[model samples]
Target chain A: SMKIDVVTIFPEYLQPVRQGLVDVAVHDLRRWTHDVHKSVDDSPYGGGPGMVMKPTVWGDALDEICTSETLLVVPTPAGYPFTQETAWQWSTEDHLVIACGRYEGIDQRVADDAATRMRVREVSIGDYVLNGGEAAALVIIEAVLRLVPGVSLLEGPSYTRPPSWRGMDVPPVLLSGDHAKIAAWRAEQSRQRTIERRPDLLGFDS
Target chain B: SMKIDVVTIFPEYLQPVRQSLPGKAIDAGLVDVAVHDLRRWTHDVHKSVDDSPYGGGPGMVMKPTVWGDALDEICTSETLLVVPTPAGYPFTQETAWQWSTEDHLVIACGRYEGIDQRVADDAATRMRVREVSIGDYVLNGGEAAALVIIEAVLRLVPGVLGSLLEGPSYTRPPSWRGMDVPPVLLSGDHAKIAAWRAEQSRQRTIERRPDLL
Candidate 1:
């Protein structure tokens, strides 16, 4: 439901979103290659393990596609953790751009430079790493899009219309139509399940 | 370099794996990927794949019998059964590195309320089973997170990323948008560049992801 842009090498992975709920444009980063005719990655300036996304290619791409209204989302393993809270916050922005970096990641200067001209949020999806950020970008998009109409179902286990299954009846409290009791029961179950399954999510020192 | 079988309700979503790196790896004979619609194991005419949880609340849980049948057929000796669930252990780069070496993997993608706990419990009796969560947030289905895992694990299979992570990068023409590429890179001294890079990597880690350092 918003104007979005994706900068990536494998634009095919992102095409699914082009057909999604928002207005999305997937730019094959190759389009911006200065080609000299071109390389998108370079060996690190200070000599490191893998390649670095050159600043110029990204700079050119951003300059051509972005506006002052743009809110740039840089998905990197090094940035602030992206959460449901961040997703809800981004749902309000009318224009958003995600720079999906591969290799070591785009140059620090590219992010530093972009920050000067517009809003820039350097985000990390989790502790995990992918071949690139394209998949994480999809994850971020899904989280945000689901919001607006908005949610997170961290509550206890759930059931639908049919009250029973395999001789197991719906918790009597849920079927009783006592809304407050259902809420309390659900919250209690949620808190209890969270403790047993994900103590870390509840601020337990993992 | 491995056999990967993914079971999901939305098989079309995993088709991209067939056409991308996973596909390329298939051609190179480094790996093979097969995506299955979990409903194929269902016996019902409705093609139903979920059911109301035994103990009720709001959403549906993936039926145990349906998932069990699918897992029994796909699992093999030395196989790793990866179940994507927010309640599972976090999937990290280190984890992807570890899983990349397994002889085979069968990923079971579940919906919101998740698969019946018994499915994982039963599968554990026969194979190396892991209940892994992609991130701290939620998604409409496991397909999105599965895509993330497939790409992450396959890229480390020898022919991807160079076939390649240490830190940030910058290249020539030195200055762009008044943001200068470091002078150390321009020095052309291998030792200097290496020393500067070592320091930059540390400083970058401490300044941003201190937890990682």
Candidate 2:
């Protein structure tokens, strides 16, 4: 069983994740703050637009919550690209810890300090900006959970009983009942569709 | 003002989005977001919206009829239809910036293998349709991707971020755990601070996303 924990200020943002197949625990980062106001962020060290997450709060939270065996994952645009391959690799870990950041980003020192005790990986969902890491964490959780055995199967385009609905006919080979030909047709369709829609995935000129 | 519509099976999945910046925009009358349930367009008693693959597969594929009906009801000639999928154009800041200028944006969230491709093809005939991927990986559905896009776009809207769009920032306690705020920020030299912050942003972007450079 994969044990996953998400630390964020918006615990309500993770409500959809509890329905997934894996075990997930959502913690509010505010609990880790020391002051009466429970503030977890401050302005960036450099004169910047947004706030930077405070390292002290994150430091306290990670030290109490994480262990040597934990695999800490931080979601940020500044991180490495997240892909299907990375999801597959993370599925094998016994414990996964996700530290969600807000404002500009978490102080660099929090990640730097966590690296001393655990395996830390910074990942980016894409080349766009998000309000926070909670949404990215939800995306990562869904991608990783679907890879577990018996959870779901990776499949391709499909049709139903009304094959000729709205003048669009289901490919004849799909209903032909010839296993070999159907498999070949499906594989070809998947490739051709990807090429037509997302040539970048196949290294083709867009 | 921007008009955003989201169609999905799991309507509750988007509840958290109501607390973000875009949500605040809606409250302040700067924008509007209308969420519709995909099942409302279904005709069957069970409200079935998915079916087994024609050949064979482990997961279900969203039916085309429901999607076609939903689109017909929600879309207008002026709408920009967006589909979030792993097999689509990689979403970027530029894409969000382009979408922010649109009058209306309709996002369709496919649940199962994916909505029938024919639905997308047909939608393209009537309205501007874009299939966007947030990243190389897949998600349970497009709702989260919609949230990401909404946040990014709303931030670009006039008056949403206020004067905070300048650059970097630092608060009262400049030093923490031996990490000191750069001296230039505290030097009170506006020219040097802007110059230094611009360089920092450029260096950070280069280090993190050399592809953008």
lDDT of 1 by residue, B89-123 (tens): 77888899998898798988887578766666667
True contacts kept of 1: 0.52
Off by over 4 Å in 2: A149-157, B21-24, B159-213
DockQ of model 2, rounded to 2 decimals: 0.46
Q: Candidate 1: misplaced stretches above 4 Å? A: A18-21, A34-38, A150-197, B22-28, B160-167, B188-195, B210-213
**Which CAPRI category fits model 1?**
acceptable
Residue-level lDDT of model 2, residues B1-213, one tens digit each, is: 788889999888777766554445556777777789999999999999998878776788899899999999888999999988877767888998998888898999988778877788778877999987887777777887887777778778775533011223445456766667678877879888778867877776666566556
Error of 1 at B126 (Å): 2.7
TM-score for candidate 1, please give it: 0.85
* Alpha carbon lDDT of each predicted model: 0.78, 0.79
Task: Estimate the TM-score for candidate 2.
Answer: 0.86
In model 1, state the lDDT of residue B96. Answer: 92
- What is the docking quality class of candidate 2? acceptable
RMSD of each: 3.9, 3.9
Please give, for residues A1-206, the per-residue lDDT of candidate 2 as tens digits.
Answer: 78899999989888877553468899999998778999887666445566788778888888888999999999987777788899999877888999998887887767777887789998888777777898889889888988876571223466776788778788889888899999898778778777776776677675
